Amino acid sequence: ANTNIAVYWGQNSAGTQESLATYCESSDADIFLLSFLNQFPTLGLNFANACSDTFSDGLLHCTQIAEDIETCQSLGKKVLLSLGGASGSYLFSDDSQAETFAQTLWDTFGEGTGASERPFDSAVVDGFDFDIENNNEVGYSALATKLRTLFAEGTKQYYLSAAPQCPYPDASVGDLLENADIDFAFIQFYNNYCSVSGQFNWDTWLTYAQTVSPNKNIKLFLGLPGSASAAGSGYISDTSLLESTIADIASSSSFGGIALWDASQAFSNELGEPYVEILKNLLTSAS
Secondary structure, eight states: OOOEEEEESSOOOTOOOOHHHHTTTSSSSSEEEEEEEEBBBEEEEOOOOOOOOOOOSSSOOOOHHHHHHHHHTTOOEEEEEEEEOOOBOOOSSSSSHHHHHHHHHHHHSSSSOOOOOOTTTOOOSSSEEEEOOSSSOHHHHHHHHHHHHHHSSSSSSSSSEOOOSSSSSOOTTHHHHHHHHHHEEEEEEESSTTTTTOOOOOHHHHIIIIIIIIIOOEEEEEEEEETTTTSSSOOOOOHHHHHHHHHHHTTTTTEEHHHHHOOOHHHHHHHOOBBHHHHHHHHHHHH
């Protein structure tokens, strides 16, 4: 499809973040990226105010999120766990360490049967997003490649995504995007020279999809802030500009839709219609 909306959820950018299920029951969004597994290989999660309980060892234990992942999935939504963010608390030393970690993710969050503490109990994520922000690329391609092998053990389709910023190549997930099979790229077109109103470089990303990406069918997403306060710059309130941008980029099989930072912002920002709704509708109208 070229009409999907992806939203990050978990970090409460707007302050007023509601439960994950609240957004899945909205109908404006299709893919939900839980933000974030912010610490690894030694596991640590952070979902701002949305989960506070822990196992004895301090690892988050999130029964409401677990319930909500299942609700979301019954409603046809996909829910991926996003690795990374701005914490500064993750790194792989090498490919072998990252391959071990694939097994860890599978057993902790996927359909793996290896006995592990499960932050989401019997809920099973639909895959993983790589929002690596520390400019260290080691291991992610090996991790993604190993995950693909493990997914065959499961009983549903799994997805891998990455969240580069628009400068190409990306200094954190470039190697991953060039060397692993990735379903979705949620490309950040703001806080950078290549934003929509700057020197918009969608063309470069299209070249990447068509000629570099191991998955030729990878779907590129226009990543935007969900409100004026969701990022320093790059918020687009001009609906004519949104409309013309979508018209330009929807013209290829590589266009997947729009990704938004974050749900709390895109759902609550009204212009008096929720911003996420405005975008969902522009996508379907272009289709």
